[PDB]
A = this chain, B = another copy of it.
Amino acid sequence: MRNRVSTVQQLTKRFSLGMLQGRGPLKLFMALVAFLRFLTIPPTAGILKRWGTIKKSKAINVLRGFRKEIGRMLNILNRRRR
């Protein structure tokens, strides 16, 4: 009964047989990781272990762009995009 992590098993059970890939595009990866971590469900073990495929530059820019998009949407919601 050694489950690696319920996060990946979720993705495995998703639909029927999920594709448990370590991702590639940091947008997709970080979006998925964000979706997990910001909701409540702990990110997949390999994420906390090796961050999948996060290089400490492009992924950083990805995060920057992410919070930028968030700031834009925040501006839209609060400021009505002025």
User: Measuring CB to CB, which residues of chain A are less than 8 angstroms from any residue of chain B?
Assistant: 14-15, 27-28, 30-35, 37-40, 51, 54, 56, 59-60, 63-67, 69-71, 73-74, 77-78
Closest to A14 in B: B15
Copies in the complex: 2
Q: Is the CB of A31 within 8 A of B38?
A: yes
Decide if the interface of chain A is mainly helix, strand, loop or mixed: helix
Closest to A33 in B: B73
What would 18 A/B residue contacts be, using CB atoms closer than 8 Å? A14-B15, A27-B38, A27-B40, A32-B35, A34-B66, A34-B69, A37-B73, A38-B65, A38-B66, A38-B69, A51-B77, A63-B71, A63-B74, A63-B77, A66-B70, A67-B67, A67-B70, A67-B74
